[PDB]
Amino acid sequence: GSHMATLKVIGVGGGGNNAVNRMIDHGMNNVEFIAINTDGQALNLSKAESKIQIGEKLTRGLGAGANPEIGKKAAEESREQIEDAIQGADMVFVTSGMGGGTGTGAAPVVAKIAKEMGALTVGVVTRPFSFEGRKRQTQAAAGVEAMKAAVDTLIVIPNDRLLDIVDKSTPMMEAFKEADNVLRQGVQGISDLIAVSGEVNLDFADVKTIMSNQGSALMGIGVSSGENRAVEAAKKAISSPLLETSIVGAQGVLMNITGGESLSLFEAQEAADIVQDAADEDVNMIFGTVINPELQDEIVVTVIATGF
Ligand SMILES: Nc1nc2c(ncn2[C@@H]2O[C@H](COP(=O)(O)OP(=O)(O)O)[C@@H](O)[C@H]2O)c(=O)[nH]1
Ligand SMILES: [K+]
């Protein structure tokens, strides 16, 4: 029979659950969301179908007060509830803001549980703005390292990079949605990859081969049309200004190209060469293609890059 991969997204702490709420608002089908927090007031406002309040004995329903040991102990003491919410997932994305008490301490525990439950486990986490100061940055760094030890693959977004994509008036929430896009489009690209049978078919086992026990990762999508569409879509897929880990140095890549019946062999090679050239390495590519005739002149390039 056919395989039906279960994808879950888990928000851990305030920033993580913020990202979950905004992704739910944007709309996202066939993904299950789990909200995990110490802060009962925030959790009450979560849109997630599955909510886990952790650490109530430790915090009396408050946040962790910037103490990552409390976040860690809260998650460990709710291990069974976390296991029960995860059970059945083939893939888990853990999103969290590093530098506070709950995200920094609980997110690596959640990631460890997911991996021990058999899920392919991806972290997507932020580092604090420099204006939040050195102690927050240093706590966040310890969280990042703990995440790296617990996940299969880790995507880090330094919040300082948001200062590169705003003008003096861009609302903070609009900036936050740009960071959200990294996780949302990564999840959606995998979901679409699994849902469709491709002319050159990639599936969840190929995702596992590229992401399992790899470390840093890049996940990107590019869309373009018209002249030079394949090159432009490929460049967009690999060129986010928000990432700590760029494409440079990638040694493994999963690339899927979707287009209409006009999709040419020549432009598929162009797109693949863009990614190889940018990595500046001998890349082990897993290459796929999907013909969607509903598409007209549009091409979509999806990239997952690892092996750094
Ligand atoms: N990009 C982004 N960063 C956030 C958001 N919320 C919080 N942060 C960042 O995440 C860090 C931890 O905040 P938070 O998740 O509320 O802390 P915790 O719940 O106590 O673990 C902060 O220091 C900020 O750098 C958000 O919605 N988007
Ligand atoms: K497929």
- DSSP states along the chain: ------EEEEEEHHHHHHHHHHHHHH--SSEEEEEEES-HHHHHT---SEEEE--HHHHTTS--TT-HHHHHHHHHHTHHHHHHHHTT-SEEEEEEETTSSHHHHHHHHHHHHHHHTT-EEEEEEEEPPGGG-HHHHHHHHHHHHHHHHHSSEEEEEEGGGGGGT--TT--HHHHHHHHHHHHHHHHHHHHHHHHS--SB---HHHHHHHHTT-EE-EEEEEEEESTTHHHHHHHHHH--TT-SS-STT--EEEEEEEE-TT--HHHHHHHHHHHHHHHTS--EEEEEEEE-TT-SSEEEEEEEEE--
Q: Give resolution in angstroms.
A: 1.8
- 14 belongs to an annotated ligand binding site: yes
Token output for 180: 């959200």
d(CA 66, CA 229): 46
Q: Report the distance separating Cα 93 and Cα 124, nearest Å.
A: 7
Distant-in-sequence, close-in-space partners of 247: CB < 8 Å, separation ≥ 6: 218, 238, 239, 275, 278, 279, 303, 305
Q: What is the CATH classification number for the domain harbouring 87?
A: 3.40.50.1440
- State the Cα–Cα distance between residues 141 and 155, nearest whole angstrom: 13
58, with CB counted inside 10 A (0-12, 13-18, 19+), is: middle
Q: Does ligand 1 lie within 6 Å of residue 11's CB atom?
A: no
Residues within 5 A (CB) of ion ligand 2: 201, 203
Residue 179 near ligand 1, beta carbon < 6 Å: yes
Cα 215 to ligand 2 centre (Å):
24
Q: Does the CB atom of residue 143 touch ligand 1 within 6 A?
A: no
95 in a known ligand binding site = no
Contact 110, 36 (CB under 8 A): yes
Rounded Cα gap, residues 6 and 115, in angstroms:
14
> In the sheet that 284-291 helps form, which strands lie side by side, from edge to edge?
218-225, 298-306, 252-259, 284-291
Find tokens 């993580």 and name the residue: 16
The residue segments making up the domain with residue 26 are 7-187
Rounded Cα distance, 8 and 4, in Å: 13
Experimental method: X-ray
Nearest CA to ligand 1 atom 26: 15
CA of 55 from ligand 1 middle (Å) equals 18
- Ligand 1 closest atom vs CA 179: 1
Residue 132 annotated as lining a ligand binding site: yes
Cα distance between residue 85 and residue 189, in whole Å = 23
How far does residue 193's CA lie from ligand 2's centre (Å)? 5
Tell whether residue 184 is among the known ligand binding residues. Answer: no
Contact criterion met (CB below 8 Å) for 71 and 106: yes
CA of 109 to the centre of ligand 1 (A): 18
Residue nearest to atom 11 of ligand 1 (CA): 97
Alpha-carbon distance of 194 to 172, in angstroms, equals 34
Which are the contacts of 85, defined by CB distance < 8 A and separation ≥ 6? 34, 50, 52
